[PDB]
Structures are given as C-alpha cells and as structure tokens.
Amino acid sequence: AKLRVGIVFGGKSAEHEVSLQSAKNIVDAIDKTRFDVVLLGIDKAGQWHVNDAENYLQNADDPAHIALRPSAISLAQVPGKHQHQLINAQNGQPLPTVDVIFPIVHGTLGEDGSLQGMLRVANLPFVGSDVLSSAACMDKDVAKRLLRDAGLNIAPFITLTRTNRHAFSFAEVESRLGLPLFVKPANQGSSVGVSKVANEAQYQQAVALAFEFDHKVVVEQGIKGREIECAVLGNDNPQASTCGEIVLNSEFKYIDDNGAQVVVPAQIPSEVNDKIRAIAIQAYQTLGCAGMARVDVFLTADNEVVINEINTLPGFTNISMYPKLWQASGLGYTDLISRLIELALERHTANNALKTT
Amino acid sequence: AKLRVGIVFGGKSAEHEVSLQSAKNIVDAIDKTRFDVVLLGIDKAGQWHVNDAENYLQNADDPAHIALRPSAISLAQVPGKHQHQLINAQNGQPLPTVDVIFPIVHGTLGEDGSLQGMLRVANLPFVGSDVLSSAACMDKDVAKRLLRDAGLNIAPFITLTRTNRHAFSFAEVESRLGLPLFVKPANQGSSVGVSKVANEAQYQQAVALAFEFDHKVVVEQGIKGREIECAVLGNDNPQASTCGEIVLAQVVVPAQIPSEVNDKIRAIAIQAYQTLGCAGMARVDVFLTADNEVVINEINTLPGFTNISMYPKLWQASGLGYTDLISRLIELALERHTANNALKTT
Ligand SMILES: Nc1ncnc2c1ncn2[C@@H]1O[C@H](COP(=O)(O)OP(=O)(O)O)[C@@H](O)[C@H]1O
Ligand SMILES: Nc1ncnc2c1ncn2[C@@H]1O[C@H](COP(=O)(O)OP(=O)(O)O)[C@@H](O)[C@H]1O
Ligand SMILES: [Mg+2]
Ligand SMILES: [Mg+2]
Numbered sequence: 168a169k170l171r172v173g174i175v176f177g178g179k180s181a182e183h184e185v186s187l188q189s190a191k192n193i194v195d196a197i198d199k200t201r202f203d204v205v206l207l208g209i210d211k212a213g214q215w216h217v218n219d220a221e222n223y224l225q226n227a228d229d230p231a232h233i234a235l236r237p238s239a240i241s242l243a244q245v246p247g248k249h250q251h252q253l254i255n256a257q258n259g260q261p262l263p264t265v266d267v268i269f270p271i272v273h274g275t276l277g278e279d280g281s282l283q284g285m286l287r288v289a290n291l292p293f294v295g296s297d298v299l300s301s302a303a304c305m306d307k308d309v310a311k312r313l314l315r316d317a318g319l320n321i322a323p324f325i326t327l328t329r330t331n332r333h334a335f336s337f338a339e340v341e342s343r344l345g346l347p348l349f350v351k352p353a354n355q356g357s358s359v360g361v362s363k364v365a366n367e368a369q370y371q372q373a374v375a376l377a378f379e380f381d382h383k384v385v386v387e388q389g390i391k392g393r394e395i396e397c398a399v400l401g402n403d404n405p406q407a408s409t410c411g412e413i414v415l416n417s418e419f420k421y422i423d424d425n426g427a428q429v430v431v432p433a434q435i436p437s438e439v440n441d442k443i444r445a446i447a448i449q450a451y452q453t454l455g456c457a458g459m460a461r462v463d464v465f466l467t468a469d470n471e472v473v474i475n476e477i478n479t480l481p482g483f484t485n486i487s488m489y490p491k492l493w494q495a496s497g498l499g500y501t502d503l504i505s506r507l508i509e510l511a512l513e514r515h516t517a518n519n520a521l522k523t524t
Numbered sequence: 525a526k527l528r529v530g531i532v533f534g535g536k537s538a539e540h541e542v543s544l545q546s547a548k549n550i551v552d553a554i555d556k557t558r559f560d561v562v563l564l565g566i567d568k569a570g571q572w573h574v575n576d577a578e579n580y581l582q583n584a585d586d587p588a589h590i591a592l593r594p595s596a597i598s599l600a601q602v603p604g605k606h607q608h609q610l611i612n613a614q615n616g617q618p619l620p621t622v623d624v625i626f627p628i629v630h631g632t633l634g635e636d637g638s639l640q641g642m643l644r645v646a647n648l649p650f651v652g653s654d655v656l657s658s659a660a661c662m663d664k665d666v667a668k669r670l671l672r673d674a675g676l677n678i679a680p681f682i683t684l685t686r687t688n689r690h691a692f693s694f695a696e697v698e699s700r701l702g703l704p705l706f707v708k709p710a711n712q713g714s715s716v717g718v719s720k721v722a723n724e725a726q727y728q729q730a731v732a733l734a735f736e737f738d739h740k741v742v743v744e745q746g747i748k749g750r751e752i753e754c755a756v757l758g759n760d761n762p763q764a765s766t767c768g769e770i771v772l773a774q775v776v777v778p779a780q781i782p783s784e785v786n787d788k789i790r791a792i793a794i795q796a797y798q799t800l801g802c803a804g805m806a807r808v809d810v811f812l813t814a815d816n817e818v819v820i821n822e823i824n825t826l827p828g829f830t831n832i833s834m835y836p837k838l839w840q841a842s843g844l845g846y847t848d849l850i851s852r853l854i855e856l857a858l859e860r861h862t863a864n865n866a867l868k869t870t
Contacts, residue, residue: 179604181870213604213645243600245613246642247536247570256602259615275869276645280655284641285603288570288633298637299663302656309656309801313666316673330760359870379868403687455666522736523632524538524716 172202172508173253173265173291175272175282177209177235182273182356184421187224187233189271189483194220196485196500202508205265207242207253208235209272215242217262230421244289252289267511268293269504271483274356278480279305292515294507295458296479304454304477307385308353317453319446320473322465324387326353327374337367340386347389350374352381357420363389390473392465395433397447398481398492399460400506402514405451407444408492410435413463423482431491439470446472458510461489529559529854530610530622530648532629532639534592536570538716539630544581544590546628546829551577553831553847559854562622564599564610565592566629572599572610574619601646609646624857625650626850628829631713635826636662649861651853653825657801661823664742665710667800674799676792677819679744679811683710686739689731694724701745707731709738720746747819749811752779754793755827755838756806757852759860762797764790765838775834777841785816792818804856807835 176190177183194204206218216238226232243256251261268291270282280302286293296304303309308326315321323344325335340348348364350373355361360380362373377384394415398408412435414428433440447462454460454477461481465473481489485500493503533547534540551561563575573595583589600613608618625648627639637659643650653661660666668678680701682692697705705721707730712718717737719730734741755765767789769779779786793808800806800823807827811819827835831846839849 179869209604215603241602241604243602243611243613243616245598245600246572247566254600254613255616256600256611257616259600259611259613280637280659281641281644284638284655285601285645287638288642290570298641298655299659299666302637302659303666306656309660309670312670312673316669381867382863403685517739521738522717523536 169201169203170266170508171205171263172197173205173207173268175207175209175215175268175270175277177211178272178275178277179209179211179213180272180274180277180356181359181420183211183235184230184233185423185482185484186272186277187235188230188423189273189487191224191227192485192487192490192500193269193271193483193504197504198501201505205262207265207268208238210235210237213276216240217242233421244285246288247290249290252291265291267291267508267515269508269511270295271480273480273482278356278478279354292511294511296456296460297514300455300457301479304456304460304479306353306383307351307355307476308383310454310477311385313453314450314474317449319449319453320471322349322387322390322473322475324385327378327384327386329378329382332374332378337370340370344386344388348386349389350377350384350386352377353383353385354381357425359420363417390465390467390475392467392471392473393433393435394463394475395435395443395466395472396461396463396488396492397443398489398496399447399451399456399462400458400493400498400503400510402457402510405448405456407447408496408498409433410440410443411488411492411495413488423484423487429486429488429491431488431495435466439466442470443472446474450474450477457514458507459489526558526560527623527854528562528620529554530562530564530625532564532566532572532625532627532634534566534568535629535632535634536566536568537629537631537634537713539713540568541588541590542714542828543629543634544592545587546630546833548581548584549830549832549846550626550628550850554850555847558851562619564622564625565595566634567592567594570633573597574599601642603645604647606647609648622648624648624854624861626854626857627652628826630826630828632711635713635824636711649857651857652804653802653806654860657803658825661800661802661806661825663710663740664708664822665740667823668742670799671796671820674795676795676799677817679706679747679819679821681742681744684731684735684741684743686735689735689741694727697727697743701743704746705730706744706746707734708742708744709734710740710742711738747811747813747821749813749817749819750779750781751821752781752789752810752812753834753838754789754808754810755835755842756793756797756802756808757804757839757844757849757856759803759856762794762802764793765842765844766790768834768838768841775837777834777837781812785812788816789818792820796820796823803860804853805835807838
C-alpha cells in the first residue's frame with residue numbers, strides 16, 4: 168500500500184555533485200507515510216546501482232568532496248516489462264518493482280531526453296518532462312526557434328553549425344546583433360562554454376571554445392536586465408509560482424546555481440511578477456513540458472520580459488530556487504514532492520490508455 | 525573479424541509487420557562480407573530477444589500473417605557499459621558486443637527518440653537520426669512549427685489539445701482553414717487516425733478519433749497537388765535522391781517532372797533535413813501544387829525499408845543499390861558516433 172519511489176541521481180554529467188545534493192534533500196523531505204524510497208544512484212561512469220540509505224553518500228556535508236558510495240550491484244533494465252523492469256546486471260536477479268521514478272540527474276543524459284526514452288521503454292512512470300520536451304529544452308537553438316515561432320520574446324540570435332561556421336564574418340554578426348554578444352554551445356549546462364564577447368578576438372576564441380562541446384553554437388545579443396526565475400508545476404493545468412531573483416556577476420559547478428545570490432521572492436512589483444508568471448506558463452506550453460520546469464528570464468529596465476532558459480530538471484536541494492519558489496507560494500517541499508509524484512502517475516495513466524492500432 | 529550489426533525490428537507498434545518486412549529485406553541484402561548480423565527482434569509486447577537468422581520469422585513469405593518466431597532469451601540493457609551492454613535478462617549472460625545498431629522499428633518508441641535515448645545511454649552507435657530529431661520529426665505539430673520558422677511551406681494548421689479542443693467549432697476552424705480538412709494525431713505513423721473532413725459531423729468524429737491515439741491533434745488545410753517524395757542521405761553534407769511520385773496506389777520512379785522542379789524539391793528536402801537536425805537518412809514527402817509551390821507534408825526518419833519501399837527505390841533510381849545503401853548508412857552511424865565522442869565534456 169506504499170508506492171516505491173525510485174530516485175535516480177548522480178550521473179556522468181558535471182552536475183553530478185549537485186545531483187547528489189538534490190537527491191539527499193528529496194530523500195529527507197519525501198513523505199514516509201505514502202512512499203518507500205529506493206536509491207538508484209548513477210556513478211560518474213554512468214552505471215546504475217541500488218544504494219543503501221544509511222551510507223550512500225560520502226562527505227554529505229561538504230559539496231566539494233561529496234561522492235556516491237561505490238556499490239557491489241549494478242543494474243540493468245528490461246524493455247517491455249511492466250513489473251520488475253530493473254534487475255541485477257550480474258545475475259538477472261529482479262529488484263522489487265518500482266512504482267514511479269523521480270529523475271534528478273541534471274544535464275546530460277538525465278535532462279536531454281535519453282533517460283526519459285529508457286524509462287518510456289521500461290514502462291516506468293516518471294516525474295517531469297518527457298522525451299521530446301526534455302531534448303528540446305536542452306538544445307538552446309531548438310528551444311529558441313520554438314519560442315520565437317510562438318511569438319514570445321527571446322534574445323536575437325544566430326546558430327553556427329560545422330557547415331555554416333565561416334559564412335559569418337565577425338563584422339556580419341556585429342551588424343546583426345550589436346555588442347556585447349554571448350556565445351554558447353547549444354546543448355550545455357551551468358554556463359560552461361559560455362562567453363561574453365566585446366570584440367573580434369574574443370568572438371573567434373569564444374566560438375572555437377564552444378565548438379569543443381557541441382556541433383552547434385548559439386550566438387546571441389546581450390540583454391540588459393535582472394534575472395528572474397519562476398517555477399511551473401503541472402501537466403494539463405500548469406500553475407506558476409511567485410518569481411525569484413538570481414544575481415550573477417562577471418567576477419568568476421559543484422554548488423547549485425554556482426553559489427550565486429538567490430532571493431525569494433524577487434523584489435519586484437506584483438504586476439511585473441504576474442506578467443512573468445503568465446509568460447513562464449506560455450513558455451512551458453510552447454515547449455511541451457510536463458510535471459515541472461523552471462523558466463529563467465531577463466527583466467529589462469522597461470519591464471520587457473525576455474526568455475533565457477527553460478530547465479526541466481532544476482536543482483532540487485533544500486535551498487535550490489525551484490523548491491524555494493513553491494515554498495514561498497504556499498507549497499512545502501514535502502507536498503511539492505508528492506504533487507510531482509501524483510502528476511507523474513496521472514500522465515502515465517493517460518499515456519497508457521492511448522490506442523496503438 | 526567483421527563488424528557486428530544489431531538489427532532492431534518489430535516493436536509494440538501498429539507498423540510491427542512492416543518492420544518485420546523491412547528487417548527481412550535488410551538481412552537479405554546486407555553485405556555478408558563486411559558484417560555479421562545479430563537479430564534483435566522486439567515482440568508486440570515490446571520485449572527484446574535475440575533471434576536466429578535461419579529461423580526467426582513465421583509465414584515470412586505472406587505479407588499478412590508474417591510474425592516474429594517466439595524466443596526463449598529475452599534481453600536487458602546495462603546503462604553506462606561500453607561493452608556487453610545487452611544481456612540475457614534471466615541470468616545476466618552478456619551477448620557478444622554489437623558494434624552498431626540498425627534500428628528499423630517504425631513509429632512509436634522506435635522512431636520517436638525513445639529507442640535512440642536508450643541506445644545513446646548504452647553507448648551503442650546507431651543508424652539514423654538521434655533523440656531530438658527523431659522526436660521532433662515524429663511530432664507533426666513540432667516539425668511543422670520548426671519548418672514554418674525556417675521559412676519553408678507547410679499546410680496551414682491548428683493544433684488541438686485536451687484543454688482547447690472545444691474552443692474551436694467546426695465553423696471557426698473552417699473559416700480559418702477552408703475545406704476539406706485533414707485531422708491527424710500529432711504522433712502516429714502511416715495514416716493511423718488520419719481522417720479527411722468535409723463537414724461538421726466528420727469533424728467531431730475525426731477529432732475524437734485522433735484523440736484516442738495522442739494527446740495532441742493537428743487539423744490542417746487540405747493541400748491540392750501531386751504527392752512527391754524525396755530520399756535524403758547523409759549527415760553533415762546530405763545528398764538528395766531523384767524524386768518519386770505517388771499516383772491514384774501507383775508508385776512512379778522517377779517522378780515525371782521537369783528537372784528544375786526535381787531540383788527545387790530536392791533542395792527543399794535538404795533544407796527540411798537540416799532544419800530538423802536529421803542524421804543518416806530521411807524521406808521527405810511534399811505536395812507539388814499546380815503552380816509549382818512545394819508544401820512539406822512530413823519527414824520520416826525511419827522510412828519503410830523493404831527492397832521495394834520508396835526510400836530504397838529512390839536511391840536505386842539514382843545509382844545507389846540497396847546493399848550499398850545499407851553499407852553507407854552503417855558507415856554514417858560510425859562517423860557520427862566518432863564525431864560525438866570527440867566533443868569534450870570538460
Ligand atoms: N543574451 C544574454 N544577455 C545577457 N546575459 C546573458 C545572455 N546569455 C547568457 N547570459 C548570461 O550567462 C548566464 C548563463 O547563460 P545560459 O544561456 O543560462 O547558459 P546555461 O544553460 O549554461 O546556464 C546567464 O545566466 C546570463 O547571466
Ligand atoms: N494537408 C493535406 N492535404 C492534402 N492531402 C493530405 C493532407 N494530409 C494528408 N493528406 C493525405 O493523407 C495521407 C496520409 O496523411 P499523412 O500525414 O501522410 O499520414 P502519416 O504521416 O501517418 O503517413 C497523405 O499521404 C495524403 O495522401
Ligand atoms: Mg542558466
Ligand atoms: Mg505520409
């Protein structure tokens with residue numbers, strides 16, 4: 168009568184350590200009365216394990232050194248099964264059935280649709296956005312094209328590929344987008360490969376760097392404003408939390424938000440707050456998100472709202488923006504976790520009922 | 525020692541039998557001197573198996589009744605491993621490692637990014653388009669919005685969700701899009717759940733029907749023109765085959781059109797291919813209007829692959845034989861895997 172909730176955390180990605188911290192806080196917050204938790208830790212090599220709750224983290228208190236305890240047992244997943252989809256990879260021994268997955272592996276694989284495809288194949292219900300949406304929110308070029316097509320405000324930009332890379336002189340790009348410019352790989356996290364550009368030397372350097380991480384590089388016009396974030400929750404009826412502010416400076420990744428200044432709620436007028444909330448929901452809908460997402464925007468001096476990013480699996484530590492925003496909007500961590508689980512099971516039921524032939 | 529090619533086929537999809545046929549044809553033609561095939565058949569319940577090439581199909585010679593021979597071994601995948609990713613799901617025994625996967629599961633799961641996601645995590649090189657592109661080409665709504673954003677022509681359309689489906693009345697849709705209309709689930713294959721609509725009754729029926737297959741429904745203006753198809757092959761510098769036509773049941777190859785039109789459609793196929801980030805292959809289907817306007821109807825990332833299907837026929841009629849097409853697709857998968865592996869993570 169209690170649902171087994173498999174929390175999937177860690178991962179190959181550079182956000183591994185932040186993922187450990189999100190997981191730790193969910194394990195602590197989650198309502199024991201309704202849910203038994205199973206710890207599904209992914210090591211830095213990308214292999215899955217079942218961890219013991221008492222000793223699964225080493226140096227849990229210290230972000231720089233925190234690590235996932237090594238485990239004897241590796242997991243495999245069995246396509247098309249509806250029970251016991253997760254097994255011991257060494258000997259085929261089945262784990263007890265997991266009723267729902269809570270993925271909290273930030274960035275690569277976890278946030279880009281790959282994990283979601285795997286879970287879809289294993290008929291595992293899961294929290295958060297599905298394959299198309301996660302893949303699309305992770306490719307900044309694709310997400311911006313969809314946002315643009317929906318009539319929503321985004322930074323003016325161009326996308327460089329391996330084959331159109333040199334068709335653009337730095338002069339051409341400056342005449343298109345003015346200065347400064349930000350240059351970034353299309354698929355990335357946590358500001359890596361991201362550079363501010365004020366001249367031609369910087370631009371050329373910036374592009375070669377970003378092309379080390381992706382086959383597509385986004386170059387976009389610099390936007391002046393406050394960075395405001397908003398937490399969206401739901402499937403068919405998305406609800407927007409109050410907004411929060413993040414302050415990033417130019418002076419300087421195992422800490423969520425890279426240890427930047429975070430204030431909740433954003434010290435902005437409620438009318439602007441509501442305008443950003445409504446826009447965050449349109450963004451959510453345009454990108455086909457499910458379960459939750461965090462929408463990050465720029466607020467200019469004249470209160471124009473420019474969408475910067477949509478994150479489908481945001482930091483979920485006890486002090487991360489996404490949970491804090493809901494806590495400030497009347498929804499506590501525990502109830503948030505439960506709401507996300509409930510939404511995941513409803514969406515699973517909806518998908519399951521669809522005809523195949 | 526030859527590259528082991530894992531052919532993934534069948535699947536829990538309406539197009540199951542088609543897939544079975546596509547794989548039979550691939551197995552039959554693949555260059556046995558370069559490649560060892562391993563047959564990764566997926567039954568209709570969606571469970572994977574290893575099949576034997578000498579006896580894996582029942583009624584193989586009969587287009588209806590053709591089915592996958594039941595197998596003892598079911599299969600599991602081990603995330604994170606770079607070798608022996610596929611194991612006996614009962615006892616953990618690994619299969620010898622497969623060097624490349626040729627997915628040919630049409631439609632749901634196989635063609636919509638799910639399978640690709642699984643393969644990406646398993647570090648298995650694979651033929652055809654990757655996670656986002658496969659997912660985006662499968663969702664007609666997303667594919668159309670991307671094509672429109674690129675400045676390419678699509679059928680004017682509205683997209684219905686469970687929350688808005690009752691907002692638009694037949695009369696309002698009609699003023700917007702004219703008649704007749706085509707109503708389609710956003711994510712489906714080969715005309716499943718697709719209806720032509722000429723009046724209100726048909727409309728409500730069609731819409732209710734599409735909503736049994738997907739949570740999004742596309743309603744489009746009917747386009748008047750010839751149905752032309754074009755095969756696209758490659759990654760970074762894709763080539764377009766000559767065009768083929770579908771006639772009132774009859775497949776005509778090459779399509780009887782002026783060379784300028786052939787080349788105009790070809791260049792548009794390629795733009796659509798790039799816009800949607802397709803890799804390895806796709807078939808682009810268009811309407812060619814009476815005034816030579818080209819309207820993109822769809823992009824198939826895993827098109828039917830029988831030696832008689834359109835995609836392989838367009839290549840044959842362009843000078844590229846079926847065995848050789850298969851080999852080039854495998855090479856392309858490997859080239860892309862290697863290029864992806866050279867991207868830095870830090
Ligand atoms: N167009 C822009 N205008 C102003 N600042 C930008 C722009 N693009 C990026 N930045 C700055 O760089 C930071 C990281 O960029 P972002 O696109 O969010 O990449 P990531 O996905 O790595 O977080 C932003 O939070 C913002 O401060
Ligand atoms: N908008 C349209 N205008 C004219 N004919 C259409 C339109 N949409 C579909 N058709 C006809 O219906 C057929 C099936 O529709 P299609 O979208 O190709 O289904 P699927 O994508 O599942 O193959 C098309 O090949 C074409 O003959
Ligand atoms: Mg960001
Ligand atoms: Mg078609």
